[PDB]
Design a protein around this ligand. Sequence first.
Ligand SMILES: CN(C)C(=O)COc1cccc(F)c1
Ligand SMILES: CN(C)C(=O)COc1cccc(F)c1
Ligand SMILES: CN(C)C(=O)COc1cccc(F)c1
Ligand SMILES: CN(C)C(=O)COc1cccc(F)c1
Lengths: 192, 192
Amino acid sequence: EDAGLVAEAEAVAAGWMLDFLCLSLCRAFRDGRSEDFRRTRNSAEAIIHGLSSLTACQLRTIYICQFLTRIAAGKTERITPLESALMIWGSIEKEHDKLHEEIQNLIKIQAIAVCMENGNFKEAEEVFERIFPFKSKLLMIISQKDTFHSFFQHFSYNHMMEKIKSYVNYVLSEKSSTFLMKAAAKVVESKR
Amino acid sequence: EDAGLVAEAEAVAAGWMLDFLCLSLCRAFRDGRSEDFRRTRNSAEAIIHGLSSLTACQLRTIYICQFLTRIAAGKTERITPLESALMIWGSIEKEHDKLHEEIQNLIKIQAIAVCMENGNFKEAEEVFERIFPFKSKLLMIISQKDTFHSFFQHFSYNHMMEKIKSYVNYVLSEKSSTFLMKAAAKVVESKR
Ligand SMILES: CN(C)C(=O)COc1cccc(F)c1
Ligand SMILES: CN(C)C(=O)COc1cccc(F)c1
Ligand SMILES: CN(C)C(=O)COc1cccc(F)c1
Ligand SMILES: CN(C)C(=O)COc1cccc(F)c1
């Protein structure tokens, strides 16, 4: 009847569910399974409410989940989903390697380009102002509605998604051996 | 890279999380930990969305969670929370023993009495009409605003909560050895 030991067991189990749901979210994002992504995101968000003290590893896990959530809502606070993804990306405790900078740059341009794709050019300019010769050339492209300019074709949505999926594959392999998924695959392999 | 085996592992893990969250919900309800109950309920509801095919045991688990959720919202569809708890209680695949009938009767009267406690006597009559010499005596009590009649004092909110908590203790012991909580308590005992 020890309430403290029970709360401790509940916190250990919340940590296991968090890693399992991050793994599931990464796979759904990689596979393009939108409805499964939406369901796993709702589950991860609820499970995270059962945690009040997080380790550095757990903080990185929750911010990766938040970041992918903004990326998945990219084509849909007073900022756009892709602007929110950029704020999380720039503050996650991670190495600022070549891949990090590539994703950062692709998000910055796509935060503008998704507004143009949606036909909201005033919003495209407001996004540009909040993020940013280069600047005056990018603002002229938005102003001229030059949505299919070679610059936008190189810093494309598909290229942003491909680079982010490559990062998702590293998270997926770094968490492939976490307790809950490993025990669950063991049960499935035993059946069989 | 087998998507089917991964989805199978995700379903096995959803089953484990469901039993763990039912256990956690039962403890919070027994302890009167309202905020913890609200958080565990949100988590259970989200996790249950990741399941599309349930066994008879899993159906009983989800309906116990739904039932306690209605009981916890009892003093707050075109029916009241306690009327919804009654519909679930009468349809759960379980034995209709003495305890089942006691809980059923206490809920039926409290579904009326919580409306009187809230000062909504028109709603108390509408609840009576939907659920129901005995009937004409119960309707006269509502009509006379006889909230503290000896009948209401014997079929009280506290007596309803005590009887439901006794049932919760049976669910709690029947699920005490489920995979996730057992593995989590093992980690906690190892630290100590
Ligand atoms: C701060 N908010 C409201 C969010 O970022 C919601 O998104 C989330 C949150 C946690 C996990 C997840 F998978 C998604
Ligand atoms: C001289 N300057 C500022 C440049 O040519 C950099 O261009 C870029 C390209 C992509 C993203 C970005 F945010 C900036
Ligand atoms: C049918 N609805 C919307 C509900 O009953 C919500 O309540 C729930 C649902 C599942 C688990 C739980 F713990 C609570
Ligand atoms: C002759 N009759 C109908 C009775 O005296 C039963 O009284 C009850 C008592 C509690 C709950 C309930 F629903 C009914």
